[PDB]
Design a protein around this nucleic acid. Structure first.
Ligand SMILES: [Mg+2]
Ligand SMILES: [Mg+2]
Ligand SMILES: [Mg+2]
Ligand SMILES: [Mg+2]
Ligand SMILES: [Mg+2]
Ligand SMILES: [Mg+2]
Ligand SMILES: [Mg+2]
Ligand SMILES: [Mg+2]
Ligand SMILES: [Mg+2]
Ligand SMILES: [Mg+2]
Ligand SMILES: [Mg+2]
Ligand SMILES: [Mg+2]
Ligand SMILES: [Mg+2]
Ligand SMILES: [Mg+2]
Ligand SMILES: [Mg+2]
Ligand SMILES: [Mg+2]
Ligand SMILES: [Mg+2]
Ligand SMILES: [Mg+2]
Ligand SMILES: [Mg+2]
Ligand SMILES: [Mg+2]
Ligand SMILES: [Mg+2]
Ligand SMILES: [Mg+2]
Ligand SMILES: [Mg+2]
Ligand SMILES: [Mg+2]
Ligand SMILES: [Mg+2]
Ligand SMILES: [Mg+2]
Ligand SMILES: [Mg+2]
Ligand SMILES: [Mg+2]
Ligand SMILES: [Mg+2]
Ligand SMILES: [Mg+2]
Ligand SMILES: [Mg+2]
Ligand SMILES: [Mg+2]
Ligand SMILES: [Mg+2]
Ligand SMILES: [Mg+2]
Ligand SMILES: [Mg+2]
Ligand SMILES: [Mg+2]
Ligand SMILES: [Mg+2]
Ligand SMILES: [Mg+2]
Ligand SMILES: [Mg+2]
Ligand SMILES: [Mg+2]
Ligand SMILES: [Mg+2]
Ligand SMILES: [Mg+2]
Ligand SMILES: [Mg+2]
Ligand SMILES: [Mg+2]
Ligand SMILES: [Mg+2]
Ligand SMILES: [Mg+2]
Ligand SMILES: [Mg+2]
Ligand SMILES: [Mg+2]
Ligand SMILES: [Mg+2]
Ligand SMILES: [Mg+2]
Ligand SMILES: [Mg+2]
Ligand SMILES: [Mg+2]
Ligand SMILES: [Mg+2]
Ligand SMILES: [Mg+2]
Ligand SMILES: [Mg+2]
Ligand SMILES: [Mg+2]
Ligand SMILES: [Mg+2]
Ligand SMILES: [Mg+2]
Ligand SMILES: [Mg+2]
Ligand SMILES: [Mg+2]
Ligand SMILES: [Mg+2]
Ligand SMILES: [Mg+2]
Ligand SMILES: [Mg+2]
Ligand SMILES: [Mg+2]
Ligand SMILES: [Mg+2]
Ligand SMILES: [Mg+2]
Ligand SMILES: [Mg+2]
Ligand SMILES: [Mg+2]
Ligand SMILES: [Mg+2]
Ligand SMILES: [Mg+2]
Ligand SMILES: [Mg+2]
Ligand SMILES: [Mg+2]
Ligand SMILES: [Mg+2]
Ligand SMILES: [Mg+2]
Ligand SMILES: [Mg+2]
Ligand SMILES: [Mg+2]
Ligand SMILES: [Mg+2]
Ligand SMILES: [Mg+2]
Ligand SMILES: [Mg+2]
Ligand SMILES: [Mg+2]
Ligand SMILES: [Mg+2]
Ligand SMILES: [Mg+2]
Ligand SMILES: [Mg+2]
Ligand SMILES: [Mg+2]
Ligand SMILES: [Mg+2]
Ligand SMILES: [Mg+2]
Ligand SMILES: [Mg+2]
Ligand SMILES: [Mg+2]
Ligand SMILES: [Mg+2]
Ligand SMILES: [Mg+2]
Ligand SMILES: [Mg+2]
Ligand SMILES: [Mg+2]
Length: 61
RNA sequence: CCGACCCGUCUUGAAACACGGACCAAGGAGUCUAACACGUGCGCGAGUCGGGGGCUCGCACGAAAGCCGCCGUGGCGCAAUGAAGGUGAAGGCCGGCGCGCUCGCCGGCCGAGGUGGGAUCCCGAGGCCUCUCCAGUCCGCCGAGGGCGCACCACCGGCCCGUCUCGCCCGCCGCGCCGGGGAGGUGGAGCACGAGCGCACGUGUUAGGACCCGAAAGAUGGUGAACUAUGCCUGGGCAGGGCGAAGCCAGAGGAAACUCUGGUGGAGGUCCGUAGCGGUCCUGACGUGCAAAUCGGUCGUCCGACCUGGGUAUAGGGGCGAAAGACUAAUCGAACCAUCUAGUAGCUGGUUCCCUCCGAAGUUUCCCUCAGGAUAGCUGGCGCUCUCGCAGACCCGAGCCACGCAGUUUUAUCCGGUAAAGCGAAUGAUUAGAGGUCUUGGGGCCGAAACGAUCUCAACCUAUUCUCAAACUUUAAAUGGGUAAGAAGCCCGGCUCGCUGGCGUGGAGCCGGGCGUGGAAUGCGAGUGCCUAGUGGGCCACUUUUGGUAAGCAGAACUGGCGCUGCGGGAUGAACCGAACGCCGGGUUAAGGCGCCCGAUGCCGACGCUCAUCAGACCCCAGAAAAGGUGUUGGUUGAUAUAGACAGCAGGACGGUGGCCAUGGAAGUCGGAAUCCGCUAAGGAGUGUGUAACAACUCACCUGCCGAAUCAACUAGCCCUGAAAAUGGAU
RNA sequence: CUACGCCGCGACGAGUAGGAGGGCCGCUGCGGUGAGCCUUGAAGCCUAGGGCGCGGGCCCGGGUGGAGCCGCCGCAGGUGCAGAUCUUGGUGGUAGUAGCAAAUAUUCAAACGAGAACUUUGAAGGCCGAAGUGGAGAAGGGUUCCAUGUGAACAGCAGUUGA
RNA sequence: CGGCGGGUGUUGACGCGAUGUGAUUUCUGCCCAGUGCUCUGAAUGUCAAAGUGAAGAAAUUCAAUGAAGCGCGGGUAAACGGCGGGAGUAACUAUGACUCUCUUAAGGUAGCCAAAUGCCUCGUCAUCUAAUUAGUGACGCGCAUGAAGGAUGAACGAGAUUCCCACUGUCCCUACCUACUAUCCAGCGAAACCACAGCCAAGGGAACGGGCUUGGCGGAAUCAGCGGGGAAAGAAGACCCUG
RNA sequence: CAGGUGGGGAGUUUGACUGGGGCGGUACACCUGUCAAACGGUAACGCAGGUGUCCUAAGGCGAGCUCAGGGAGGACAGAAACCUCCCGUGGAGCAGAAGGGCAAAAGCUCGCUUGAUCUUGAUUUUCAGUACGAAUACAGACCGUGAAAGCGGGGCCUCACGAUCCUUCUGACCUUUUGGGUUUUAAGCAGGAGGUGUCAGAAAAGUUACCACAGGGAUAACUGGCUUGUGGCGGCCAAGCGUUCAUAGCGACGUCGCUUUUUGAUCCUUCGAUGUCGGCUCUUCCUAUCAUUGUGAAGCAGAAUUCACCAAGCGUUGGAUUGUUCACCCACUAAUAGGGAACGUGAGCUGGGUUUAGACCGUCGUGAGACAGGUUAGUUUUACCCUACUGAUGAUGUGUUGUUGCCAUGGUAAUCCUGCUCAGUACGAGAGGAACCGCAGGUUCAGACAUUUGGUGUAUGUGCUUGGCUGAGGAGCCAAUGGGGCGAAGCUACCAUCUGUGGGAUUAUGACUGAACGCCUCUAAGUCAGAAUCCCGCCCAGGCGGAACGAUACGGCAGCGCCGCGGAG
RNA sequence: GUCUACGGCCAUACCACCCUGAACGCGCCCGAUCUCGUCUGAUCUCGGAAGCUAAGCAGGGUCGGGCCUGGUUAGUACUUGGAUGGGAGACCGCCUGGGAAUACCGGGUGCUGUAGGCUU
């Protein structure tokens, strides 16, 4: 008839058998969820980075 | 001699008083097809595949093999996206031009962009050489740095299709409700120089009998009334007695009506009782029988709704029923036979060789789900991508020592509201006094008279005071949770922006350059993908904890264990304590032990405590409390004592006063108050006995004899009482 | 140095459900191969015989048997049993046990015969007691009827008797 | 299944068919609200198909009309069924003839009762006994009696119950006898059941052991009985739950 | 063809959780506080509650105010009508449950309004990191408000809700409507709504005692096990009762236990079955003792009674009613104590009760049917196995065999009452009224026995007798023992008769001597008496235990014993 | 040494009462034509400058309340980990680390940023 309802017994052991790994912190996070206005201006800046290349290389030289 | 319970199975737990198994032989259970998915092997490869057909002495093999190529039709792949109409995947640089207006017209090139990682490869200053040197010939190794960067990963761009928002151009044999193009978001199982196709094998899932065996049922078509049930037809049968209906005769009495008496007669779903038919009781016999319903005695009925043969009729959701769901061939709340059918089963049982390696879950979410699934988790297998190097042919290193990770600490830095604490702090609960002064508090005795007054009790206020809170809180731990402890960092410059804006502003991105003491300890090699079984009943212990009187009860948290685990110890035992396991020899231990069983104290072990006429004897754990003891042993506090304690033996224990109010005696003692004085050696106007009451005693108080220590109240060790259960018995 | 081989060093070893690997473990059949084995003795079976392997198992000796069988490389399965109140067959203990007890009852002599409680004959004692344990039919059976012979099996003891 | 098919029916209301109750005697009360059944269609409400009209280019849509049935209206309880409460009140108390109200479709009438029907209950009283949860008689606010079934009443009953006389081995309290067994023998000869087996106490353990631990102890092979155990056998529990 | 009727018939369904199921409840979808052990998460049919709504404002913005309460004042006016001042950290209000939050607020009052609108994505919460719901931050429109900064895409926050399929509506001068075109129609694309409350979402009434199957000890009914609330039995304190007097005998308020003979709680074993009540029969055990033996105490004069100790040896009965366990009554008695053993005991019985199928009544139900309501009728199977027990042969060893014995060990048995005398005695005012020794007998039990009495009787012994049969007499027989009278022997009956026993150590208790503790003291050392108890005797059996003693193998080759350490082995 | 405007932290800043205040300032104050609101020029808005520091405000004071910070409470309460420690239990002791809160007793009573004034 009746039976056990809930437990977390042995659950921690199951969790730690393969380790509780943190998320893989990797360079260049995704731009998901960033403000769209800021993102579109960022895209415009990236697009127009091409101009001023001669000035950039002159300064570098 | 030591060890040793019977296997299989379900189970948290099996040696179980849980089930199956008397024994032996033979048979006996994950198969085949189809479809997927992934992995592996093979061939070819932007293709691949003849499987259907055809051609080849038609055929021992050969029903094979070989070949087709204008037999590649076709399948799958090579293009996606949209419901669809439909549409449908190339960009980067140098420029001259409108106005290089965030854009329109062309050239020259190249051909899927860039950032950060990135095995490998390339260059490489400088080193390693011999008998030595000034001087260059050829190549080998190490090498700081630098370069091109595979696959793959993260990110930023770009392109295709759908759909929104904004907006301006372009095209024409149809100037249109025509067609095309742009920018910015967003939806797609896309593109971004293919990876598929065929065959084989393995695993997993599914449909099929589907691992094997197993229902109660449902449907179709037939066979039965030789038993029984009922109707009909035609036959057969039922001793002996009792009662005595109508009708009748005679005699008698009556005016009649009629009545009385004696016979006669022989009716009746009548009575006793054979045969027959039935079947009450013994709850008899028997109960592996004589018998799958019988036998003995006793019984019901026995001229009738009676018993019975044969012939007929009614057939299964039908019959037939004086009705019991009875009977319908030992079968009836729906017969029997065959078939559909190997029906289905989330349920039970079983499931066949060996060794090696790894090794669980009883938990999350959803489900007409709670004995089941899906899902995540836990498991295994297959790998792949990287890191340290692989060193000297024996030998011999010649500040700095890997990508990265962690059930851990340290150093910083946050987070919290439990334990505790608090209530003279809020919110609730709550005890008792104290001090104040207003009132629809009671009132208060002489106040009415202006309670002339002020006495008490209330309420109220004030300062205190006792006790509390899971659903209170000022304060507030321990344990705990997050983050950081660098090269993705720091610092210099420069460029882009349509975002932001006094500003060369802010922010973000991008491009170069320089910094290595690698910026705590300790340990460890990491990252990543695919497929995937079993499980999804748990239980126990320390501690925390809810319900309950409690429970070997029910429910949670943490860790460990049992399940899945043997071994040493606890005599015995799933969980306790120790410790985890290949087969052995030697040494030593753990926990636990060392009188004998039974290895080891057969030590000249140490110090004490304890006598039980129910002693005691080791975690879990297997039995006890309050309360007592002048048993004994310690300890605490206090008291008395040569100005003679204590204990014994012996005296006084009075006067007022036989004190007052209680009275019917209470005179010291049935009760209420107060505790005087003096004699002194002391005496309570009384600790008890008692007398009706007197009286007579005793005590506390003093004294005498006695001559050295003694007394009291507690306290806690062992022991004892408290302490009663059933077969004889358990450190 | 069978490179699918050989050699060295270090650490490690519990295991249900489950997963994987190896098997010079085992069964049956097919393609190859062993110029394999075999009537001078195959398979199978038995064995206080000798051994090998951790093991699954295997080899050899002895006996019995009397005609086929096996190793290796591949291939393919209706391929391995202690259980399923498993299927079929066989066999134990129980156990020379329960039992051969419903309806009164047999005895004597003789014959046949190897053999007599049971057959036959005679004598005796009983029973059914005419609603029979008598004499005849229907249904049903189907040769059981009758004579002779036998003593295998059957007649739950026996039989010289018998459906 | 079907045919103007068939049974009642070779029949015709003193007949067939369908029900209830159950001889005789005496009775069979009230309720048509409910559910049934039935009668009437009265203007009548609703009401399908078909048919009619209209709109439309048609599909189609709309409207008008309006069969049974249902609603509306009567009847019917020997149709199914049903048949109440609360207060006060008589010159001792106690009851309540009587009086108030609320309510129903009607409020259980005649009868009968601790009945085979009454919980409380072993009701109360009487009788039967020494003693009676039994029996009988009586009472009745009766949990929850009651009229096609109530109440009676001879005869009858393998029906249930109580008492009395007689009778007895039912018993006190057992004994003896007879037949057939059992028993022993000759012959013949099964079956059920069977993990292995079979002496106990306690312990622990799936919380009641034949096995294990600790103790008690243990002597071949057997016969006749026996019913304590083997949680004996017989059947995959029929109770309960789940599917 | 259409509508109605249609359990006559057909098919099917008749949720889940659940300290068994049902009834109850919703712990089934949500929300607050707690549990919850200071991150988060965390369960029970845990506790306290709430929800399926409400709101054109209670949404949005802006402005201006301050609330609850209290104190002091003012005509009617009072405890509460309005006006004024002061204090007022919120003690108010914010729709609702609760928690959090809020003061020139988020509250109150005004003014203007519709951001409760049109859109794409991302994210948080539950989470599998799926959905729904809800929510957060943005971005793009169109707006509202304010001077403006700003704020607003519902409600201050934590809840107030819903897939596929289908339907309905709205939008695109949109797509398709199948050879083409036009127009209706239909289909589609996007967004709302109609709902699944079992709230991740079937379309669903009963009954079965006529029942069935697969299972379940995952799960109740009976034993056992844990617990002991309840039941039962005790203890501690002593306010009181007890003519005075707490404790002779009791024990309020409190409090500590024990027991498993009550009833519960739980669900560990058993559902391929452990036969379920009571009675009968029979044995054993316990003591918390009713009687009896030995004692102590009393509010014990005697008698009777009461309390307590050692103590379970022995006994604890006959009946009416009821199925009863319990109960109650009658009567006897020394007493008529309480219990256990699978609520002992069904292959021991019985079957009255409960608890199958038939049937009647009452109540309930429309009905099938139901009822810890009443009533009546209702199959009780097997032992031959092992052990245990009861008896019966035997077995091992002493060379064989016999006689006579011993005793290890086991069993064990006696019990109670009455009458006479003591004795109308002690004691007592009286009423009443014992005891010790002794005597005579009985009860229950045990072991026998048959002289007597009784029973049996198939000596089938002897008469009598019925029916039949042998021709009759005589003699007999048959009738399953024909019937009956008397009856030997044997067996047998409290239905006759006989017999039934002695010590020891001691318990309780009462004492001696005697310290501890110059006194006392039954105790500490040492002593005494002491019983239905205990042990033994008497009695029953006699060990895989012994003793003493007897006889020990031919008339023929045949066996044996002792002496020899005699020999070879 | 102070003030004003705008603030940051938000009581060491608050609350009650008392004392002092030079110069600027801040205020109180005067008035309602205009702007704008009222039952009321009280508030709000506007136009002013006779008087006043009475009040706000600033500074100081109080064996002041509060608040802040210490000591005590106290290595107490509580607590991580350990034992085949004790005890019938309830609970308690020890080892290993951490470690509070009242009452009670002290000290303190705003600091400061930007801009602009006054103070010989
Ligand atoms: Mg579970
Ligand atoms: Mg099983
Ligand atoms: Mg179980
Ligand atoms: Mg087992
Ligand atoms: Mg068991
Ligand atoms: Mg069983
Ligand atoms: Mg089973
Ligand atoms: Mg079996
Ligand atoms: Mg078998
Ligand atoms: Mg086989
Ligand atoms: Mg071919
Ligand atoms: Mg083609
Ligand atoms: Mg790259
Ligand atoms: Mg990209
Ligand atoms: Mg798969
Ligand atoms: Mg099958
Ligand atoms: Mg069906
Ligand atoms: Mg017939
Ligand atoms: Mg008759
Ligand atoms: Mg008759
Ligand atoms: Mg019988
Ligand atoms: Mg019936
Ligand atoms: Mg089947
Ligand atoms: Mg199961
Ligand atoms: Mg909390
Ligand atoms: Mg606390
Ligand atoms: Mg408080
Ligand atoms: Mg538990
Ligand atoms: Mg449980
Ligand atoms: Mg398991
Ligand atoms: Mg494990
Ligand atoms: Mg282990
Ligand atoms: Mg061990
Ligand atoms: Mg032990
Ligand atoms: Mg060793
Ligand atoms: Mg030992
Ligand atoms: Mg030893
Ligand atoms: Mg004791
Ligand atoms: Mg292993
Ligand atoms: Mg097979
Ligand atoms: Mg086999
Ligand atoms: Mg026999
Ligand atoms: Mg016999
Ligand atoms: Mg005769
Ligand atoms: Mg005849
Ligand atoms: Mg013949
Ligand atoms: Mg024979
Ligand atoms: Mg009739
Ligand atoms: Mg009537
Ligand atoms: Mg009509
Ligand atoms: Mg009428
Ligand atoms: Mg009446
Ligand atoms: Mg009545
Ligand atoms: Mg009755
Ligand atoms: Mg009677
Ligand atoms: Mg009566
Ligand atoms: Mg009357
Ligand atoms: Mg035993
Ligand atoms: Mg079953
Ligand atoms: Mg069954
Ligand atoms: Mg039906
Ligand atoms: Mg916590
Ligand atoms: Mg928490
Ligand atoms: Mg405002
Ligand atoms: Mg917006
Ligand atoms: Mg909001
Ligand atoms: Mg749901
Ligand atoms: Mg269970
Ligand atoms: Mg008194
Ligand atoms: Mg049985
Ligand atoms: Mg049994
Ligand atoms: Mg006693
Ligand atoms: Mg019993
Ligand atoms: Mg029995
Ligand atoms: Mg029985
Ligand atoms: Mg009965
Ligand atoms: Mg019945
Ligand atoms: Mg009967
Ligand atoms: Mg026998
Ligand atoms: Mg003896
Ligand atoms: Mg005895
Ligand atoms: Mg005669
Ligand atoms: Mg004669
Ligand atoms: Mg004769
Ligand atoms: Mg006769
Ligand atoms: Mg006689
Ligand atoms: Mg006698
Ligand atoms: Mg003396
Ligand atoms: Mg003594
Ligand atoms: Mg003595
Ligand atoms: Mg102060
Ligand atoms: Mg500590």
């Amino acid at each position: 008839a009746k039976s056990k309802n809930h437990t977390t017994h042995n659950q921690s052991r199951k969790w730690h058998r393969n380790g509780i790994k943190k998320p893989r912190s990797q360079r260049y996070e995704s731009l998901k969820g960033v403000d769209p206005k800021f993102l579109r201006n960022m895209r415009f800046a990236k697009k127009h980075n091409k101009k001023g290349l001669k000035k950039m290389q002159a300064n570098n030289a």
